[PDB]
Design a protein around this nucleic acid. Structure first.
Ligand SMILES: OC[C@H]1O[C@@](CO)(O[C@H]2O[C@H](CO)[C@@H](O)[C@H](O)[C@H]2O)[C@@H](O)[C@@H]1O
Ligand SMILES: [Mg+2]
Length: 580
DNA sequence: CCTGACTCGC
DNA sequence: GCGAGTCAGGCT
């Protein structure tokens, strides 16, 4: 049943056709400066397998790779593009990426290999990568015979699946989403990951020492207040000290035992002086383990840069995710954690970090899609939306809005931005589910358009089986018909939240594409470094700041045209921390 | 070596 | 509402 192919010892002309399925295999999950273990090409002339050391040293092959007119169909082209960048080789002409195509057709499938994508079209003449390479300690590249056939089978599947995938995307009206948005974005993310972000390791190591000292003190104080020493990091051991030895009350209980979440401890603080210390301990320990030691582990010792990997085909909303390290969750709320950002600096002297973020893009998108007159007017006046929401919900003038009123109005808006449950609102505001319901009801009286939208989107999700975003990204919600209240309610909140969060994702992705085109036209050295959901982080010569101050916000604000303006705030400084 | 509990961002 | 990374504890 084996698949026929040529295991070539040298590159030939028929291997350089202007249309082909290409496989440039990188087995290591983290593909930065990683090995390319084999190459497979499938075209009109047949199927071929080439040894990397052979193909990558061949002028003809390298030129073919870099020729934008020679079209390649691939799976996860960013992986190959970056692996090639580290070797000084440019990959161009990728006209179809099966991973991105499968992701757009149904992000819930979790397609992470050619076999998974192929199964969507009843194509099974290819093995899952895990079956070929195993997983974990047993992971490894098999002998050439097995490797070669696997790569050729993947290339063959890609070659065969391009047409059906493109046809369904077209039917879904997502063909431009793939070709004009996700694929071009893939190349931009590849440049961003490759460039990396410079880290001041000495700065990180210094704060690391401080934390270590502060942890040691708090750690001791904790054993003193408890009368004994224990593993504070053990929610099991901590529970014993807290709810048994010290007799603190049990307010919430986890599926396995005593709940020691920050929300719980906060309520126990007044009962004993140990609680505040445990909280402070959790905090410092979080920064030390995750943002100091964890970050230092992934910095490249030679360039002192971190090279994250943006997973472009994971989230169900269209947002990107970041790993090794995750640069989308660097502290900022609390000052102590915020200082971690002083560790991220420009890659060159006399360069600066420039950060631009969308102001309330989710609520602006909601005003647009729901066409709520009150909400649209609020943004047209560029009002503080939380203060305004408080004025309406509580029926008071702007002067009458107290800090606590604004805080609660902010929580209601937050719940709308992320589509959290009524139960979630009650929990966040530490009030009763019933009182939370009253707030929500009050909100709908003030924003009837939003109310209308929420009801209409749920019905639409039930009728069509999915909801869509501004640029036609899609999310199937089969649980929307479930007779189980909880499961159904969850699907309903996703129906409400996806067009909002998803459309916000579409916009920033287009802004990134538009921005890169503008930077190139202007011949600026500035370049994108990171994207954190609603913000773009760049670095550039200090001499380009003034131009970026006008260029970046404009490009971001004009990415799309909504019924309300889009607003972008920006700052720049010597470190990421200073770009505030 | 995998799940639960925790916490960080938006 | 979720992404990711940490830890501890049980697998084994
Ligand atoms: O190259 C990223 C791309 O690969 C997938 C599998 O096709 O994920 C792999 O690589 C990620 C980054 O190293 C890991 O987080 C993940 O565990 C590994 O399977 C895709 O999900 C992703 O788009
Ligand atoms: Mg913002």
């Amino acid at each position: 049943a084996a698949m026929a192919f040529t295991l070539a010892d040298r590159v030939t002309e028929e291997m350089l056709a202007d249309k082909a399925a290409l496989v440039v295999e990188v087995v290591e999950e983290n593909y930065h400066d990683a090995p390319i273990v084999g190459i497979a090409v499938v075209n009109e002339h047949g199927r071929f397998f080439l040894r990397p050391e052979t193909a990558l040293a061949d002028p003809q092959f390298v030129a073919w790779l870099g020729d934008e007119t020679k079209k390649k169909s691939m799976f996860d082209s960013k992986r190959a593009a970056v692996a090639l960048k580290w070797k000084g080789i440019e990959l161009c002409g990728v006209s179809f990426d099966l991973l991105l195509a499968a992701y757009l057709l149904d992000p819930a499938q979790g397609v992470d290999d050619v076999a998974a994508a192929a199964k969507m079209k009843q194509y099974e003449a290819v093995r899952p990568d895990e079956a070929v390479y195993g997983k974990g300690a047993k992971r490894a590249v098999p002998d050439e015979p097995v490797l070669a056939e696997h790569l050729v089978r993947k290339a063959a599947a890609i070659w065969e699946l391009e047409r059906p995938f493109l046809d369904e995307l077209r039917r879904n009206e997502q063909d431009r989403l793939l070709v004009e948005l996700e694929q071009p974005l893939s190349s931009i993310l590849a440049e961003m990951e490759f460039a990396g972000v410079k880290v001041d390791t000495k700065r990180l190591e210094q704060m690391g020492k401080e934390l270590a000292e502060q942890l040691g003190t708090v750690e001791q104080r904790i054993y003193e207040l408890a009368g004994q020493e224990f593993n504070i990091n053990s929610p099991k051991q901590l529970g014993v000290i807290l709810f048994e030895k010290l007799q603190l009350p049990v307010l919430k209980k986890t599926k396995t035992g005593y709940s020691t979440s920050a929300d719980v401890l906060e309520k126990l603080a007044p009962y004993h002086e140990i609680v505040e210390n445990i909280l402070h301990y959790r905090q410092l320990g979080k920064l030390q383990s995750t943002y100091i030691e964890g970050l230092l582990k992934v910095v490249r010792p030679d360039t002192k840069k971190v090279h994250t990997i943006f997973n472009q085909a994971l989230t169900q909303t269209g947002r990107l995710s970041s790993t090794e390290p995750n640069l989308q969750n660097i502290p900022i709320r609390l000052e102590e954690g915020r200082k971690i950002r002083q560790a991220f600096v420009p890659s060159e002297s006399d360069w600066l970090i420039f950060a631009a973020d969308y102001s309330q893009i989710e609520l602006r998108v909601l005003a647009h899609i729901a066409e709520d007159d009150n909400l649209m007017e609020a943004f047209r006046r560029d009002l503080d939306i939380h203060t305004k929401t408080a004025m309406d919900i509580f029926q008071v003038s702007e002067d009458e809005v107290t800090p606590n009123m604004r805080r609660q109005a902010k929580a209601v808006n937050f719940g709308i931005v992320y589509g959290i449950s009524d139960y979630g609102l009650a929990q966040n505001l530490n009030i009763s589910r019933k009182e939370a319901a009253e707030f929500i009801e009050r909100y709908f009286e003030s924003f009837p358009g939003v109310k209308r939208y929420m009801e209409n989107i749920v019905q639409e999700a039930k009728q069509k089986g999915y909801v869509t975003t501004l640029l036609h990204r899609r999310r199937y919600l089969p649980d929307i018909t479930s007779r189980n209240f909880n499961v159904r309610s969850f699907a309903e909140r996703m129906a409400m939240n996806t067009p909002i969060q998803g459309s916000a994702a579409d916009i920033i992705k287009k802004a990134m594409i538009d921005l890169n085109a503008r930077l190139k036209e202007e011949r600026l050295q500035a370049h994108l470094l990171l994207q954190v959901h609603d913000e773009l982080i760049l670095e550039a010569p200090k001499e380009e700041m003034e131009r970026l101050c006008r260029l970046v916000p404009e490009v971001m604000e004009q990415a799309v045209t909504l019924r309300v303006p889009l607003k972008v705030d920006y700052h720049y400084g010597s470190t990421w921390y200073d770009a505030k």
